[PDB]
Ligand SMILES: O=[N+]([O-])c1ccccc1O
């Protein structure tokens with residue numbers, strides 16, 4: 111049967127004072143008939159989305175800043191102030207519901223040391239469970255400067271993640287600048303889930319892999335939504351090319367490269383969530399490659415509907431159990447993987 115106490119952890123908010131900013135997101139991601147509900151949910155962490163979560167058997171929601179969030183703020187000082195305001199806000203919101211709400215840090219990713227300190231403040235002072243960062247940090251006019259976290263100066267930040275022993279959720283964001291104009295203006299409906307978001311995240315996390323981040327920090331934990339942002343279908347092709355071309359080519363030049371095969375990182379350092387991917391067939395394929403213990407249920411609210419995402423997992427319990435390898439695998443994906451990963455105490459319906 112279906113289960114209660116599900117953990118859901120790609121669930122976005124915005125600062126209520128910036129409700130006007132949400133309207134631009136609604137233009138990019140929200141059908142007209144879903145606008146009222148979106149605006150209610152994105153601006154009210156304890157509102158109707160909490161009632162829906164209770165109704166639909168979610169025991170624990172981890173909130174995060176929506177996208178791009180700080181990653182779209184191009185002025186370092188403004189970005190840092192905004193991230194702090196977001197963390198203080200969601201801390202105050204979740205304070206009243208500790209048995210069923212947690213949060214991920216919003217971070218300005220302009221400076222590794224400053225981001226490290228804000229993550230440390232969130233985890234150690236606010237009880238946050240990790241970080242959620244919306245892909246590259248944008249800087250300069252129109253955000254044309256793309257700051258990637260797979261370069262060596264970010265080692266001080268990955269060290270902080272490992273010291274705090276919390277995961278880093280690498281979430282997508284829209285295109286900026288010349289990339290937006292050159293490659294998306296003539297196909298604007300592909301901004302978002304259809305191709306742009308995965309294209310960016312997969313580039314970034316593969317960049318972390320091939321630049322040696324997980325070799326230097328073997329205990330680093332990273333989370334990708336959407337069942338791995340295109341990578342699982344290409345597990346064979348990517349590692350094949352690494353064996354056939356990239357690894358020996360890099361070695362011949364003395365260039366840094368991933369020391370281990372791609373699947374090693376997805377079996378040790380990376381977890382997937384089911385956000386916006388309520389697909390039993392895709393889930394099965396992923397399970398067959400990374401293991402049922404490495405995939406976490408999630409909805410992607412408010413861009414997805416809690417009743418739809420929970421409806422998939424609950425109403426199709428038997429078929430999904432068959433797909434993922436039995437009743438334990440099911441409860442694991444729904445709840446117990448996350449309970450273990452985030453070291454969760456007792457929470458709402460956590461043993462239901
Ligand atoms: O994660 N998503 O796919 C997503 C899609 C559209 C808008 C925001 C999001 O977070």
Ligand SMILES: [Mg+2]
Nearest residue numbers: 120281385410
């Ligand atoms: Mg999302």
